[PDB]
Amino acid sequence: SMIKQRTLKNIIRATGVGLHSGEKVYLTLKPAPVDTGIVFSRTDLDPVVEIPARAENVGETTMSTTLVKGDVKVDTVEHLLSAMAGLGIDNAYVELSASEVPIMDGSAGPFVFLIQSAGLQEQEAAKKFIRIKREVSVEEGDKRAVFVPFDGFKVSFEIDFDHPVFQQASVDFSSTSFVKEVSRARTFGFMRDIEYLRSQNLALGGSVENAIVVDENRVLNEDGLRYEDEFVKHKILDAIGDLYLLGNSLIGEFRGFKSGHALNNQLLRTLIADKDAWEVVTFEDARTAPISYMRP
Ligand SMILES: Cc1ccc(C#Cc2ccc(C(=O)NC[C@H]3C[C@@H](NC(=O)[C@@H]4C[C@H](F)CN4)CN3C(=O)C(C)C)cc2)cc1
Ligand SMILES: [Zn+2]
């Protein structure tokens, strides 16, 4: 009845564009051995450069989560890391032909469909969990990010934009479906920012195909929103991706108050350093565990 590690049953290939780069990228997810973790490969480079998707390799947090090793980056990892967190994937190689993970439709939805179509493989090794034992809070200005002990996994988030088109949601993932209620929540941008962002080489691949485009009053996307609270649900999607840089699924609660990649990563570093606040645990019997995973 032991909760076991999971990899992919089959290879997944996808094609898309970097939100930021506007570059066409070829993506391949490969099964990986027990205790590998999630490892990105820049296969376009000779030799190939691999970066474990871990907090210590986070270099940039400016309008995406960026893994860095010397002069080499992988931009915008948080949506795919979100899908792999959501579906309980411990071990995978992520091959990219370019520096940015493809944006797809702007959500984790295409990533979860492609993975679940390929299926997952249970492996003969206990799944390791990070359990929160003490409260860990970081703040900078009016922003705030907290880990709280919780016998399960749950994410609360609040944003506070002053904009007509608005901002609080809480999700317990032993009670709520990641696939149905979170994975389809798209990234969003404001018309005002897109002009400025175009300048400082950003949003080069952005469109209504991969983002909720907002002017001063309205969503411009013809078909509108997938959820009434899509904006704050996408912040939760991002936080789940960032949390996974821990390298093991969490047993605790996350609370974001206007937090983002920068302050999320501040929290990860503080938590990792305060070893009184967390422990690695396994579950030899799934039936008594606080969390549970869909059939593989
Ligand atoms: C013709 C055309 C149409 C559309 C576009 C575009 C675009 C676009 C521009 C900027 C952004 C953008 O960074 N939004 C950030 C938003 C959403 C959310 N972050 C994420 O989703 C992260 C970062 C990446 F988005 C992926 N995970 C939080 N967030 C903000 O706080 C901004 C308001 C500053 C997102 C999309 C360009 C041209
Ligand atoms: Zn996002």
Q: What would the DSSP string read from start to end of 13-47?
A: EEEEE-TTT--EEEEEEE---TT--EEEEETTSSS
- Ligand 2 centroid to 124 CA: how many Å? 33
User: What's the rounded Cα separation, in Å, for the pair 195 and 71?
Assistant: 28
Give the CA radius of gyration of the chain: 18
User: Active site includes 261?
Assistant: yes
User: Residue 45 has which token pair?
Assistant: 């480079």
| Domain range enclosing 105 | 1-128
User: What's the rounded Cα separation, in Å, for the pair 222 and 42?
Assistant: 36
Beta bridge partner(s), residue 19: none
User: What's the rounded Cα separation, in Å, for the pair 218 and 212?
Assistant: 10
Is residue 259 located within the same domain as residue 215? Answer: yes
Longest dimension (CA), the chain: 55
User: What's the rounded Cα separation, in Å, for the pair 227 and 268?
Assistant: 29
Is residue 87 located within the same domain as residue 153? Answer: no
Is residue 61 located within the same domain as residue 199? Answer: no
Is residue 260 located within the same domain as residue 286? Answer: yes
Ligand nearest to the CA of 198: 1
Q: What would the DSSP string read from start to end of 194-260?
A: HHHHHHTT--TT--TTTSEEE-SSSB--TT--SSTTHHHHHHHHHHHHHHGGGSSEEEEEEEEES--
Technique that determined the structure: X-ray
Is residue 139 located within the same domain as residue 111? Answer: no
Q: Ligand 1: which residue has its CA nearest to atom 26? A: 64
Task: Find the catalytic residue in 42, 186, 255, 261.
Answer: 261
Q: How many CB atoms lie within 10 A of CB 142?
A: 8
Is residue 176 located within the same domain as residue 248? Answer: yes
User: What's the rounded Cα separation, in Å, for the pair 110 and 83?
Assistant: 9
Is residue 135 located within the same domain as residue 218? Answer: yes
Contacts 24+ apart (CB under 8 A), 114-117: 114/12, 114/14, 114/29, 115/8, 115/12, 115/29, 115/83, 115/84, 115/87, 115/89, 116/87, 116/179, 117/12
Tell me which of 17, 19, 182 to substitute to probe ligand 1's pocket, judged by most ligand atoms within 8 Å of the beta carbon.
Answer: 19
Resolution to 1 decimal place, in Å: 2.3
User: What's the rounded Cα separation, in Å, for the pair 269 and 259?
Assistant: 15
| Domain final residue pick, 101, 128, 155 | 128
Chain center to CA of 65: 9
Cβ < 6 A, ligand 1 pocket? 63-64, 76, 78, 187-190, 193-194, 197, 203, 206-207, 211, 213, 234, 238
| Domain final residue pick, 69, 98, 128 | 128
Q: Residue type for 229, please?
A: D
Q: How many domains does the chain have?
A: 2
| Domain final residue pick, 75, 99, 128 | 128
Residue for token digits 């605790």?
252
Is residue 182 located within the same domain as residue 93? Answer: no
Of all atoms in ligand 1, which is nearest to the CA of residue 213?
A: 4
Is residue 135 located within the same domain as residue 92? Answer: no
Closest among 14, 32, 34 to 24, alpha carbons compared: 14
Question: Residue 119: helix, strand or coil by DSSP?
Answer: coil
